[PDB]
Amino acid sequence: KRQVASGRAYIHASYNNTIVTITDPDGNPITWSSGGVIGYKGSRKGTPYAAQLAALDAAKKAMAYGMQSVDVIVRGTGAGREQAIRALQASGLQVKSIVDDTPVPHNGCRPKKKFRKAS
Amino acid sequence: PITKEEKQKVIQEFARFPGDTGSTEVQVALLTLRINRLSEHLKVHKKDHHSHRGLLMMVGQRRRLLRYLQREDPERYRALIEKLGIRG
Amino acid sequence: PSRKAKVKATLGEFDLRDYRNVEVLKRFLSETGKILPRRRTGLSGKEQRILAKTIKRARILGLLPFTEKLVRK
Amino acid sequence: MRRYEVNIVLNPNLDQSQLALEKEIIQRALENYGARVEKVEELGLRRLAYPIAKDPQGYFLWYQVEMPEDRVNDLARELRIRDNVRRVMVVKSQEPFLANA
RNA sequence: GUGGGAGAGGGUGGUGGAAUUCCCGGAGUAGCGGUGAAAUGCGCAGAUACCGGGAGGAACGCCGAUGGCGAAGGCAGCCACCUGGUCCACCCGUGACGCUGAGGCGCGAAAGCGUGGGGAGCAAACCGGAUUAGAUACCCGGGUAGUCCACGCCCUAAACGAUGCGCGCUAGGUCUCUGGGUCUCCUGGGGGCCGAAGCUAACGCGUUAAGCGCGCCGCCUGGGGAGUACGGCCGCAAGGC
Ligand SMILES: CC(=O)c1cccc(N[C@H]2[C@H](N)[C@@](NC(=O)N(C)C)([C@H](C)O)[C@@](C)(O)[C@@]2(O)COC(=O)c2c(C)cccc2O)c1
Ligand SMILES: [Mg+2]
Ligand SMILES: [Mg+2]
Ligand SMILES: [Mg+2]
Ligand SMILES: [Mg+2]
Ligand SMILES: [Mg+2]
Ligand SMILES: [Mg+2]
Ligand SMILES: [Mg+2]
Ligand SMILES: [Mg+2]
Ligand SMILES: [Mg+2]
Ligand SMILES: [Mg+2]
Ligand SMILES: [Mg+2]
Ligand SMILES: [Mg+2]
Ligand SMILES: [Mg+2]
């Protein structure tokens, strides 16, 4: 209850669950949501449907702080990244713009076996 | 590096006659020059093994040229070494 | 296809060794601070080879970017 | 001696005095290190591609010299010492390679 | 010799940004993570997701290749210094000074060893979760040596082109890297593919020979026993020859 109106929406997707965090004009988080935030427990958390329901909740909760316009930022790629974006797009918040800010190393740390095997 | 001057200097310095760009003396001269430089470089960078080979070969080509000389005209030989300061 | 004009065609006489012509170098970076592939830069093995360095100098000096955020998505 | 190109990007907030002061130190050290200025281009301020010391702008100096290579590195060890000096870069001079020309 | 060229060739110092981890601050709750599912695990001493600051180690995205350099092992951010090899042009100088090379000496991925330093991520062993009939594994959560630097040692390998080196000779075609030229092509060095002649058991090789010849080195002589035993040499040890 501050009344931000316009803010930023951060969508963090992964193949294990998605998670939206609605922030304000300079970065500080207002509300946040995830597949876990909603019902979904384990595997089910990843699913793009969850993305949608987490995306909504993310905004609905944002609406409270009087949100209206938001800028989307997408970190990651996975089980339902887009859906989240689309879910927001409707929500009831004007999507000023979307942007892929996914982090990439310029080759720094040897990844766990899990992600190596390549070169 | 060996400046162009540095080079020619040594060249005229040994040349058997005006224009002698590559007699056995000149060559032993120049080779000795490069060696000593490189050898110096290696007192430091003792880990720069890759450049060591270069030396290893320069030494080779030199000691191999001198052999030819000594065999051909033993006089010039002595003259060259004593001068240059090779052996020991 | 990748055919949208060669970044070389749309240009003039430029010193590829000039690590400060932000104006022109800016032309070879993608929609990110990435060095465009020859198949877009239209340069040659030797040219594209120097460009690379020259661009990297710019980055360091602080003139050219290392990477941009992507818009749309 | 070889021919070089010094690059110096210092704080873009120095006032006429503070600024022309750091140039003092520069111009000074330059000399102390056999640097014989052949010329110079002072572009001044420019919008940095990314923030350099939180500051998103910079003051660019460009001094092309002729100096004893045996000390080029030291010349910069010094140049960097300054607090307003946030970027130093000595590039070997090179014949401009033209292309698409 | 003079004049040019390309290059992740090597050694020292410097330094740039991305990312991870950690610490601090802000804002913000109830989850995060992870999987085929799960669980362990972490989180209300407030985790995750987001923003600002700091500390540290390690590696160097795009360019980047079908590419380049090196004798091999191998070699990628940028900068300077020190330094090796190598190619082209001119045909200027020496005038057989050449080739090969038992022994020697040097180099030699990874792991490993000794002393000291460093330690972000990763991760033998290990400690746990899971799966299974069982799981001393495969999946998940942690994690020590190690991986990093220095100095010394070890010297092995599918150390591979499974193809020792040098020279001469024997159709072409095509793509490519780099040098010269009279530069829609010629010419030199290098990397690939197709293929004349020929070679091959076949597969294939084919001016980058595995073709036709000469020189020198190394090596093989059915499989197992066995790279074992004995002896000797080397190594701190492991172990090597
Ligand atoms: C549904 C499923 O993937 C499933 C179900 C029960 C047990 C399991 N065992 C799995 C078990 N979690 C396994 N690792 C795993 O989680 N993976 C990411 C592949 C083991 C612990 O390392 C596996 C490799 O033995 C497994 O993937 C093989 O099992 C089967 O293929 C299997 C199946 C398909 C049916 C019945 C017995 C079986 O061993 C999987
Ligand atoms: Mg060289
Ligand atoms: Mg002649
Ligand atoms: Mg004669
Ligand atoms: Mg090792
Ligand atoms: Mg050790
Ligand atoms: Mg781990
Ligand atoms: Mg593990
Ligand atoms: Mg070794
Ligand atoms: Mg060829
Ligand atoms: Mg035939
Ligand atoms: Mg063939
Ligand atoms: Mg028998
Ligand atoms: Mg013993």
DSSP string across D3-50 = EEEEEEEE-TT--HHHHHHHHHHHHHHHHHTT----EE---EEEE-SS
Beta pairing class for D57-64 and D2-10: antiparallel
Taking the C-alpha atoms of residue A65 and residue A56, their distance in angstroms, rounded to an integer, is 15
- Give, as one character, the DSSP assignment of residue C65: -
Tell me if the domain spanning B1-88 has CATH number 1.10.287.10. yes
Shortest alpha-carbon distance between residue A1 and chain C (Å): 31
In this structure, chain B runs to a length of 88
Shortest alpha-carbon distance between residue D49 and chain C (Å): 5
Strand E-proximal residues of A, range 29-58, CB below 7 A, are: 29-32, 34-37, 41-46
Residue ranges and CATH numbers for the domains of chain C are: 1-73 (4.10.640.10)
CA distances from C61 to A45, A46, C36, D49, D77 (A): 46, 43, 20, 9, 16
Instruction: Find the B59 Cα to ligand 14 centroid distance in Å.
Output: 37
The method of structure determination was X-ray
Contacting residues of C for D87, CB less than 8 Å apart: 60-62
User: Containing domain of residue D12, as a range?
Assistant: 1-101
For chain D, the domain total comes to 1
CA-closest candidate to residue C28, choices C60, C53, A105, D50: C53
For chain A, the domain total comes to 1
Judge whether D90 is closer than 8 Å to chain C, CB to CB.
no
Instruction: Find the B47 Cα to ligand 14 centroid distance in Å.
Output: 29
Taking the C-alpha atoms of residue D61 and residue A5, their distance in angstroms, rounded to an integer, is 45
Judge whether C69 is closer than 8 Å to chain A, CB to CB.
yes
Domain harbouring A77, CATH code: 3.30.420.80
A21 touches strand E (CB under 7 A): yes
Strand E-proximal residues of A, range 57-116, CB below 7 A, are: 75, 101, 103-114
CA-closest candidate to residue A84, choices A61, A53, A43: A53
CA-closest candidate to residue C52, choices C7, C6, C15, C16: C16
Domain residue extents for chain B: 1-88
The angstrom resolution of this structure is: 3.4
Taking the C-alpha atoms of residue A13 and residue A79, their distance in angstroms, rounded to an integer, is 7
Question: Do the beta carbons of residue A7 and residue A34 sit within 8 Å?
Answer: no
Contacting residues of A for C70, CB less than 8 Å apart: 99-101
Question: Do the beta carbons of residue D36 and residue D2 sit within 8 Å?
Answer: no
For residue D37, give both structure tokens: 């200025």
Q: Is the dihedral of CA A31, A34, A40, A42 positive or negative?
A: negative
Contacting residues of A for C73, CB less than 8 Å apart: 74, 85, 98-100
